[PDB]
Design a protein around this ligand. Structure first.
Ligand SMILES: CCc1cccc(N2N[C@H](C(=O)O)C[C@@H]2C[C@@H](N)C(=O)O)c1
Lengths: 273, 281
């Protein structure tokens, strides 16, 4: 059977573009002459074309371990947090985490942050990308970083947030030392990284706490934005699989091999740097 | 059982080895007991187990893991090899102690790679590392894949750069950048300390080595003259990990404990305690 890959729109790791009229993907090459590999990804019911860092990784993994796949975008648009089921005892995961645990997906191929919360229930590959958390602002906003009076002593005058139901949302709620910041953040968190980044571009949002490999790419493309340049917490992205999946070991070995032979270096130069 | 044979390897600041306190003849606080098998001479397997005292970044990890995962251990230093090398398909070092079941756990500056992962299970990485570059302040280079390293003779004068041979760094460059390896062997360094002196005295332009080791040295370098590239340009990013026997029943809880230490601030405190220096690029 074909492996059901779930992913999420998150440039430069996953680009999502409309198909052409005949349902195929427009042929493209990088500025350096490399063919841009594109796969069909269904999403919210309509086929689309997906490519980028993680899609390149998915193709390498499929050919290395000899498996076929079908890609779909996460139905609710979230990465995945655990929520209480109302008037019940059970907890359930949303986002890509829920789809992986439901069976709607066999493997998560996305910038999925490894943390203790998710590792209790799923198996993570070895990290295919090392990065961390940083802050994105609009050019003209001046803050020191994570330990700013405007962030440590929040008010409705300086609005900062992150993405709902994400690793960063988990990080700020579990820590009692971040309770004041999280209270400000929970009333402003955005549904998507793109909506939050554009909100910083519309000056509605003043700071955006998110993944460094995404925010730094956003600054290099939209010079009206800028990051702190500081990493206040470091984390890695990993492939997500169900417990005792038959592919766990060879996915991790494949990723380690890709770091060591320069394949990930090529992905970084193509998509991130 | 909850008692575990655990092997380690001296490499400051991750594992630091001291003698027992002469007055009490026990291991003082901050340190844990470790035993080293010390040979009588180079012409015998005869030797004596000597009591020593170990401390450092990864020793503090071991204490946290033993407290959190609830196990006790006998810690001992590896004596044949260092981290782990496959010599004629036979492992030495800490990896050898794990694969051949003399230890159930290896704690130290042990780099995760594919070759070792086929014979041992690795925990989640607890610190990041890889191939990084150290230069004197003012030198402009991107990383291992810089054309100034790949094609050294495209520039006049060519960069004087090298590594400490016979380790994972040389093996990686040999496979990925054959000409760069051929070129840089003329600048082989006998050790890390030699390379720093060669950098600070103008005899060498770049030192290519373990990122975690280079970041530590740059953080405490005097005058802060030596700097490393940014973390985004580290080549073949990986990390130090706890090695366990294949199919170890300790791997899951050790993974969860390490990820807990990362998320709850315990890991950053150990980095502040052992790894962060005065200098900040
Ligand atoms: C991608 C190649 C790489 C990634 C990360 C670290 C290194 N290293 N370079 C050293 C050497 O060449 O002696 C020692 C150290 C490895 C050492 N921790 C070990 O476990 O073997 C190589």
């Amino acid at each position: 059977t074909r492996l059901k890959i779930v992913t999420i729109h998150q440039e430069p790791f996953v680009y999502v573009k409309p198909t052409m009229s005949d349902g195929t993907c427009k042929e493209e090459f990088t500025v350096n002459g490399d063919p841009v590999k594109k796969v069909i990804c269904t999403g919210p019911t309509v086929p689309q074309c997906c490519y980028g860092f993680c899609i390149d990784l998915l193709i390498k993994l499929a050919r290395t371990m000899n498996f076929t796949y079908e890609v779909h975008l996460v139905a609710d648009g979230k990465f995945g947090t655990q929520e209480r089921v109302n008037n019940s005892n059970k907890k359930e995961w949303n986002g890509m985490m829920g789809e992986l645990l439901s069976g709607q997906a066999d493997m998560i191929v996305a910038p999925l942050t490894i943390n203790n919360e998710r590792a209790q229930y799923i198996e993570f590959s070895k990290p295919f990308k090392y990065q961390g958390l940083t802050i994105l602002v609009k050019k003209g906003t001046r803050i020191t970083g994570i330990n700013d009076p405007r962030l440590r002593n929040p008010s409705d005058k300086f609005i900062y947030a992150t993405v709902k139901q994400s690793s960063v949302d988990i990080y700020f709620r579990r820590q009692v030392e971040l309770s004041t910041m999280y209270r400000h953040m929970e009333k402003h968190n955005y549904e998507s990284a793109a909506e939050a980044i554009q909100a910083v571009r519309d000056n509605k949002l003043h700071a955006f706490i998110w993944d460094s490999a995404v925010l730094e790419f956003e600054a290099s493309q939209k010079c009206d934005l800028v990051t702190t340049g500081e990493l206040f917490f470091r984390s890695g992205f990993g492939i997500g699989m169900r417990k005792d999946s038959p592919w766990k070991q060879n996915v991790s070995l494949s990723i380690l091999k890709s770091h060591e032979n320069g394949f990930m270096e090529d992905l970084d130069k193509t998509w991130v740097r | 059982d909850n008692h575990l044979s655990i092997v380690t390897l001296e490499e400051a600041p991750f594992v630091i080895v001291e003698d027992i306190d002469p007055l009490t003849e026990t291991c003082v606080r901050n340190t844990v007991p470790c035993r080293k098998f010390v040979k009588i001479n180079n012409s015998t397997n005869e030797g004596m187990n000597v009591k020593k005292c170990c401390k450092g970044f990864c020793i503090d990890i071991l204490k946290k893991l033993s407290r959190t995962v609830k196990f006790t251990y006998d810690l001992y230093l590896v004596t044949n090899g260092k981290h782990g090398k496959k010599v004629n398909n036979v492992w030495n070092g800490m990896i050898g102690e794990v694969v051949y079941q003399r230890a159930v756990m290896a704690v130290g500056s042990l780099t995760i790679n594919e070759e070792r992962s086929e014979v041992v299970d690795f925990s989640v990485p607890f610190v990041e590392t890889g191939i990084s570059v150290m230069v004197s302040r003012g030198t402009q280079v991107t990383g291992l894949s810089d054309k100034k390293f790949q094609r050294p003779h495209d520039y006049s004068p060519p960069f004087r750069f090298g590594t400490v041979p016979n380790g994972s760094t040389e093996r990686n460059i040999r496979n990925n950048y054959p000409y760069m390896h051929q070129y840089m062997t003329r600048f082989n360094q006998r050790g890390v300390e030699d390379a720093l002196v060669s950098l600070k005295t103008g005899k060498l332009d770049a030192f290519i080595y373990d990122a975690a080791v280079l970041n530590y040295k740059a953080g405490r370098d005097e005058g802060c003259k030596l700097v490393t590239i940014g973390s985004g340009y580290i080549f073949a990013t990986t990390g130090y990990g706890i090695a366990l026997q294949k199919g170890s029943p300790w791997k899951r809880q050790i993974d969860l404990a390490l990820l807990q230490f990362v998320g709850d601030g315990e890991m950053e405190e150990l980095e502040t305690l052992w790894l962060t220096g005065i200098c900040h690029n």
